[PDB]
Amino acid sequence: PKLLYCSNGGYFLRILPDGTVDGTKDRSDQHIQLQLAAESIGEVYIKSTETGQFLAMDTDGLLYGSQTPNEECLFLERLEENGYNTYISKKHAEKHWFVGLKKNGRSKLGPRTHFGQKAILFLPLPV
């Protein structure tokens, strides 16, 4: 189990129960305890320990919580240099659609993310 610390405004990825994912500067929230599992090497799954939903990304690139894992719940996982990670939506690895949060907490649409951005670096912390 592990908080997912986005380096941007310092939030913690939070998959909510209505499927809305966004970020929170609140550690205490239990909807932010995600656990990562790996479907293969370099490929990871991310799911709420609280609700069991899965992280996932539309075709619009909208991070969203899915009740059951699928083609959209899989994410590439690179261990950047700052020591920070980076999850590339697999289904949209071709267009570098990263999982990211903006400074205001909202998520970032896959398409507007871009390597080198600061909203795309998460630092997994223990739960």
CB 120 within 8 A of CB 127: no
For 61: left if phi > 0, alpha if psi spans -120 to 50, otherwise beta; the answer is left
- The response to whether 41 counts as a known ligand-binding position is no
CA dist list (Å): 55 to 9, 41, 107? 20, 18, 12
Question: Would you say 3 is a known binding-site residue?
Answer: yes
Q: Is 91 annotated as a binding residue?
A: yes
Please tell me whether 47 is known to bind a ligand.
no
DSSP letter for 66, please. Answer: E
Q: What is the C-alpha separation between 12 and 7, in angstroms, rounded?
A: 9
Residue 102, marked binder = no
What one-character-per-residue DSSP string does 33-45 give?
A: -EEEE-SSSSEEE
Residue 2 marked in a binding site: yes
Q: Do the annotations mark residue 74 as ligand-binding? A: no
Binding-site sequence positions for heparin: 1-3, 88-91
Q: What residues form the annotated binding site?
A: 1-3, 88-91
